[PDB]
Design a protein around this ligand. Structure first.
Ligand SMILES: CCCCCCCCCCCCCCCCCC(=O)OC[C@H](COP(=O)([O-])OCC(O)COP(=O)([O-])OC[C@@H](COC(=O)CCCCCCCCCCCCCCCCC)OC(=O)CCCCCCCCCCCCCCCCC)OC(=O)CCCCCCCCCCCCCCCCC
Ligand SMILES: CCCCC/C=C/C/C=C/C/C=C\C/C=C\CCCC(=O)O[C@H](COC(=O)CCCCCCCCCCCCCCCCC)COP(=O)(O)O[C@@H]1[C@H](O)[C@H](O)[C@@H](O)[C@H](O)[C@H]1O
Ligand SMILES: CCCCC/C=C/C/C=C/C/C=C\C/C=C\CCCC(=O)O[C@H](COC(=O)CCCCCCCCCCCCCCCCC)COP(=O)(O)O[C@@H]1[C@H](O)[C@H](O)[C@@H](O)[C@H](O)[C@H]1O
Ligand SMILES: [Zn+2]
Lengths: 481, 27, 24, 228, 202, 41, 63, 224
């Protein structure tokens, strides 16, 4: 046993896939638009998976056969795997409206999202290089298809091709690293790998073959999370695709990759090389994002760059070896995810507006004044303004970084937060104080999208009154590795 | 004196799902 | 292509003469 | 089981009644959204013989003695109280919104003069034809107030908001206007061309307001407008 | 044709893909008659008896732009002479009581006073107050900030900027009253209950 | 890899069906009641 | 509990984007959120129990 | 009012248990767009009061604080919309048609005052009386319009299309019939007889019109 939570989502995907194709290819049902019927059913398939994974959390480690030769499930994986499904479900909740407006007959598009979640669930628990690569391939492959869903419009398909090549290269680079890592280790399991690589220290103890592999595996992961050293065309992918598909790739693959990153590198590899590369990436991502937030104008692209800047703050936790720092990274991932879902949902709130600049998004003070305050909260959360939940996560990242001793890295993060805040007050000024740009009038959304904002915006502000639970949850996960 | 065939099954299912929710706390 | 495919199903073979078998 | 859930219909009434137990802080909600409005005919002692093709708007309380011709409209919210003196409407006379085609009892000297409006008489919005006869193929102005015994001759448009005093029957083609009864000008022939054009277009436009008389099934079937 | 339809009069009358969509927070008084293409916008207020019809063009009242009691707002066919004459009562315009409009394109922050008849192409410019009975002929662009009036739309006065600053306050006061009315009506109605009790009497 | 071959099948289908089957060969789709039918051009 | 108070606020200001006015029948779902607060606090006692164990399990594994 | 708001909530709370609670049983009856202007006497914390012998037309709304006395009438399409201050309509008046009597709310630019309509006042059609302390046995003309604070004194026969100005205390018996308010002529006595007899004319014509019924055959037709 022990694979039942993953088995259910794979079975649920197959059952939805058979239901969608048989029904969609039905003259009797007049070839109906299954998407949105596959939806709701798809959202509850994730929710049933969430319950099964949570229910069997003590039972997850049922047998040595699964952990030693296939995948190992641990307390850290369970807490993040629960979050991964919740992140996936939250994205589906905002996405349902997009399915309704679009002529979505793509029942398969939901099955791809569930298949991606199954790949992501296998990715979090993957304990072998073969398993991690195969799981990464499935999650990315499902994602490649979602990017090219709007075939009639070349803008989505061309964006998909750049995402596909970046994905193929990232998987391929990681694969080459596995080959080199395999050559020295003689085994592909992370557990066997850790025994050979424990305290390898490429300066203290010679390890030419292992390092050659480690260099490739680390580089491949960075392309997947849109790290700035390998950001490449990844920011382009975010703006070119419509906002809802962009949201799904924005949070769920990134969270899965970050959780996979901590497991593959901290436990398996012990050299003074892995922490430093993230430290350089963190400084660069925040610097690139801060420059980009001022440089970028389109609201969708700006969100991607703000997300890239936040990704750098997340990277610092791995960069500082302290377990408290790894915990701080987890606090950041959760806050960034809630804000990223909230931010995409506010953009999704202005569904009526076609692609438009920030100035057009302004003038929301007179109309939808509460939404205007809600937009201000979303920008503030990435900005690092103190009352919001993001600052508390950043302060833990910074407090851990000061304890870790990363004064230079910590300072640039504060400086990048400072660089971001000026644009955010300017954006807040744009919303109410100035640049209304025509007094444009917006349209309503579904209750689920409003609740995504309601359950998140209140929580972002409520974090100050009761911040203890999240901090407790995050450290437990870091210690488990 | 009834609604469309199948709507009744869903209405019955909702009560059995809601009964389960109270029951889950109870048992 | 939405062109009408040649469905190879039909009614079973029953030799259909004209009504003038016996008495015109 | 379903359909016996009418208990929720009965439960709603308890709360639909809890408005009484909650209208105590001041005398509140004397309105109940009732049903009766003796409006679309409201026959006092004479009945309108309005045609089967003369679209009257369900707001238009065409009281008492009225007659409308084939193709003429009686638009939204226009009372026609033919209660004390006879009224009539020729084929094509589009008595537009908010009209007051209610006639008279008298005004200071007899002057019964049953209002008779000819064909193709495009009457304007908010017009008040209190007690004048109107001739064929003229275009009264939106906001006009046509007082007692003002025979508006043919093809003579009355201006927008143009109050016309008593007995000041305008000539043909003489565009009237002004708060006092004064003429304005003799515009052009294109004026009468557009008068006839607007008259026939308003006739077929009222023939396009057949959705006003649609049935519940047809209203909810139009609610398919979302899909298209 | 029969008279006394139980339905009363449906206040939102679409025809041919043309739904006079009412934005929320727009108290559309129950007497009114929306028809064809009448896009009332946020915070607007269509008050008692005010008809708003629909032609080839489209009526549109703007943000906070009320259309007060018993005010007809129609639009001419195309009027392609100078500009497409689709009535656009833009933001904060207080079309006062028992006025009348047709194909005129009013500009932000006006006050179209009582019984003020209008006509085509009368682009009443921004921040413009019109006196009572403000009748206008086609094309008379009442300029900015200028009080007007008269039966042929004769100019009267330019306005001090304090009155211009007060116009938005009057628009939002009307909107406050409109919200006080909107709190008097519920999403659906209880008329159906009375109609069913009528039908069960049959 | 079984699931990866299945995802490759689903992908080659959803990508390169090219509107040549029920993806769009359902029908052109038409509704009479909403249709103007010469009332509106 | 405080969570029920939270689920009244979250139900309001929600659909405010839709400008829907005030609250409706599904809006009064603060009993469900009240349950969330009770579980969140309960999870923390279990999480803190486990968090102490995570430090002690680390020490037992460390030896 | 606070408890009025709570009442709106319980009625809404109940209305939902019928809207899809028991209507979902195959019933789209609540989905019909029936009118709501039939709330003739629309209400607030202040309510409209109307006596027995006072015909109110069903095409006409009477909103706000109203005090329709005896003999008064509100004919087809009129709107006595007087939320701010009471529309203290006296006795035996005769609105006669699509008129309007407003204390309609503005930003207190002129301190809107109640509209104390007098007695036997046979207001004509389309009159747009607005903050009008119009006294008794007065005539207002067809298509007319008035302005704030006006006091149409006894027997002041305002003419058609007229537009009386603000705060103008028109003298008792002076005929003002122009857009700029302007006295024209001391009214004659035959006009006095006409205005004092048309009062009881409509008083009887309004006690007539006998709406007070239902037309089921037409209801059955419009049902199909
Ligand atoms: C406490 C007091 C009660 C609080 C509320 C309790 C829950 C109410 C039922 C579930 C939520 C439904 C909802 O919010 O719909 C509002 C929404 C209001 O719309 P409307 O303004 O009436 O106009 C129609 C809309 O357009 C309608 O939208 P549309 O036209 O776009 O239609 C799309 C459709 C498409 O919807 C979907 O396909 C989405 C389905 C998502 C999954 C299921 C969601 C519901 C179940 C949630 C979890 C239940 C367990 C407990 C709670 C856990 C935390 C949520 O939307 C639906 O609403 C479909 C049905 C949704 C419910 C599905 C599940 C039904 C069985 C289970 C009910 C569980 C009730 C738990 C109550 C707990 C507290 C007492 O739709 C409704 O159907 C309202 C029904 C109101 C009348 C019934 C009143 C009595 C109800 C029973 C007593 C009170 C309980
Ligand atoms: C979020 C996802 C919600 C969800 O899928 O279903 C809930 C059912 O439940 C309540 O609407 C009932 C009210 C639910 C209230 C939830 C409050 C959560 C508070 C969380 C704590 C605060 C934040 C702590 C951190 C919402 O309606 P639904 O989807 O069933 O079904 C429809 C519904 O009829 C309409 O809202 C629309 O047609 C559509 O948007 C959809 O919602
Ligand atoms: C409480 C929850 C509300 C449940 C409402 C209910 O019965 O809908 C049953 C399923 O019913 C259960 O799934 C079970 C509902 C159990 C309700 C128990 C109440 C005590 C399905 O009806 P249906 O196919 O006509 O679906 C409805 C739909 O639910 C509404 O939201 C739409 O507005 C309506 O047009 C129509 O599409
Ligand atoms: Zn009269």
């Amino acid at each position: 046993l022990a694979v039942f939570p993953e088995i259910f989502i794979i079975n649920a995907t197959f059952i939805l896939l058979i239901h969608g194709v048989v029904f969609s290819t039905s003259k009797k049902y007049d070839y109906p638009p299954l998407a949105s019927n596959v939806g709701w059913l798809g959202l509850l398939s994730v929710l049933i998976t969430l319950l099964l994974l949570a229910a069997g959390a003590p039972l997850l480690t049922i047998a040595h056969l699964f952990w030693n030769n296939l995948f190992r499930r641990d307390n850290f994986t369970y807490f993040c795997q629960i979050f991964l499904l919740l992140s996936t479900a939250g994205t589906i909740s905002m996405c349902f409206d997009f399915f309704d407006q679009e002529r979505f007959d793509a029942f398969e598009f939901i099955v791809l999202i569930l298949l991606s979640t199954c790949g992501m669930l296998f990715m979090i628990s993957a304990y072998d290089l073969i398993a991690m690569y195969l799981a990464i391939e499935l999650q990315s492959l499902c994602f490649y298809v979602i990017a090219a869903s709007k075939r009639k419009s070349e803008f989505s398909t061309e964006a998909g091709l750049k995402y596909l090549i970046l994905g193929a290269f990232s998987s391929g680079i990681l694969l080459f690293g596995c080959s080199m890592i395999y050559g020295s280790t003689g085994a592909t399991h992370f557990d066997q790998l850790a025994k050979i690589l424990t305290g390898y220290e490429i300066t203290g103890a010679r390890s030419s073959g292992i390092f050659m592999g480690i260099l490739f595996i680390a580089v491949g992961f960075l392309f997947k999370i849109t790290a700035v050293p390998f950001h490449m065309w990844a920011p382009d992918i975010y703006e070119g695709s419509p906002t809802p598909v962009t949201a799904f790739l924005s949070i769920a693959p990134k969270i899965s990759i970050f959780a996979n990153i901590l497991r593959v590198f901290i436990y398996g590899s012990y050299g003074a090389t892995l922490q430093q590369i993230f430290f350089f990436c963190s400084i660069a991502s925040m610097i690139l994002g801060a420059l980009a937030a001022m440089a970028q104008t389109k609201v969708k692209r700006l969100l991607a760059y703000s997300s890239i800047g936040h990704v750098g703050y997340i990277c610092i936790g791995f960069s500082c070896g302290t377990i408290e720092g790894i915990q701080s990274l987890l606090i950041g991932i959760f806050i960034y995810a809630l804000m990223t879902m909230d931010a995409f949902a506010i953009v999704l709130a202005l569904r009526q507006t076609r692609v438009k600049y920030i100035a057009d998004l302004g003038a929301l003070a007179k109309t939808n004044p509460i939404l205007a305050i809600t937009f201000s909260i979303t920008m503030f959360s990435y900005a690092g303004i103190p009352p919001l939940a993001g600052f508390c996560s950043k302060f833990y990242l910074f407090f851990a970084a000061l304890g870790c001793g990363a004064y230079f890295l910590a300072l640039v993060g504060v400086v990048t937060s400072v660089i971001g805040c000026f644009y955010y007050i300017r954006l807040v000024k744009r919303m109410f104080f100035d640049t209304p740009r025509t007094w444009i009038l917006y349209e309503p959304m579904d209750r689920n999208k409003s609740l995504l904002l309601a359950m998140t915006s209140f929580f972002i502000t409520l974090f100050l009154l009761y911040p203890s639970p999240l901090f407790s949850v995050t450290h437990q996960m870091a210690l488990s590795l | 004196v009834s609604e469309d065939k199948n709507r009744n099954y869903a209405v019955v299912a909702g009560v059995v799902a809601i009964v389960g929710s109270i029951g889950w706390y109870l048992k | 292509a939405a062109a009408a495919a040649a469905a190879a199903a039909a009614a079973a073979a029953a030799a259909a003469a004209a009504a003038a078998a016996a008495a015109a | 089981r379903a359909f016996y859930s009418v208990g929720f219909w009965i439960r709603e009434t308890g709360q639909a009644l809890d408005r009484l137990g909650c209208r105590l802080q001041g005398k509140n909600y004397f309105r109940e959204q009732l049903s009766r409005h003796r409006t679309l005919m409201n026959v006092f002692d004479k009945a309108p013989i309005v045609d089967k093709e003369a679209f009257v708007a369900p707001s238009a309380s065409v009281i008492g003695d009225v007659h409308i011709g084939r193709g003429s409209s009686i638009w939204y919210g226009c009372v026609l109280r033919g209660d004390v003196n006879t009224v009539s409407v020729g084929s094509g006379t589009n008595i537009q919104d908010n009209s007051l085609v209610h006639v008279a009892k008298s005004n200071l000297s007899g002057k019964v003069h049953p209002t008779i409006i000819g064909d193709n008489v495009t009457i304007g919005h908010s017009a008040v034809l209190h007690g004048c006869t109107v001739e064929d193929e003229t275009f009264i102005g939106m906001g006009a107030t046509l007082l007692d015994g003002v025979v508006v001759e043919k093809h003579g448009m009355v201006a927008a908001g143009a109050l016309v005093r008593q007995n000041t029957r305008i000539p043909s083609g003489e565009v009237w206007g002004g708060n006092p009864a004064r003429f304005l000008r003799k515009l052009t022939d294109e004026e009468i061309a557009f008068i006839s054009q607007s008259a026939t277009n308003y006739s077929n436009l009222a023939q396009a307001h057949a959705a006003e008389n649609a049935k519940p099934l047809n209203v909810i079937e139009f609610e398919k407008v979302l899909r298209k | 044709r029969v008279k006394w339809d139980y339905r009363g009069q449906r206040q939102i009358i679409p025809l041919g893909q043309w739904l006079p969509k009412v934005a929320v927070d727009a108290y559309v008084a129950p007497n009114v008659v929306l028809a064809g293409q009448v896009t009332v916008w946020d915070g607007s207020s269509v008050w008692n008896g005010a008809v708003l019809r629909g032609d080839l063009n489209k009526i549109t009242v703007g943000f906070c732009s009320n259309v007060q009691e018993r005010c007809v707002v129609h639009a001419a066919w195309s009027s392609p002479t100078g500009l497409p004459a689709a009535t656009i009562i833009d933001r904060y315009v207080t079309v006062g009581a028992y006025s009348l409009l047709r194909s005129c394109t009013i500009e932000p922050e006006c006050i179209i006073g009582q019984h003020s008849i209008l006509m085509e192409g009368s682009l009443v410019e921004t921040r413009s107050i019109l006196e009572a009975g403000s009748v206008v002929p086609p094309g008379r662009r009442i300029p900015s900030g200028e009080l007007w009036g008269g039966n042929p739309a004769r100019f009267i006065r330019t306005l001090t900027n304090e009155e211009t600053l007060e116009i938005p306050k009057l628009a939002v006061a009307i909107n406050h009253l409109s919200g006080d009315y909107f709190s008097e009506f519920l999403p659906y109605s209880t008329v159906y209950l009375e109609v069913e009790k009528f039908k069960k009497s049959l | 890899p079984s699931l990866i071959l299945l995802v490759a099948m689903i992908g080659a289908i959803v990508l390169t069906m090219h509107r040549t089957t029920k993806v769009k060969r359902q029908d052109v789709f038409r509704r009479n009641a909403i249709d103007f039918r010469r009332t509106i051009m | 509990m405080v969570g029920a108070l939270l689920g009244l606020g979250t139900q309001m200001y929600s659909n405010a984007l839709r400008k829907l006015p005030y609250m409706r029948h599904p809006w009064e779902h603060v009993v469900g959120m009240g349950l969330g607060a009770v579980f969140a606090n309960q999870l923390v006692k279990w999480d803190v129990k486990l968090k102490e164990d995570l430090d002690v399990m680390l020490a037992k594994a460390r030896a």
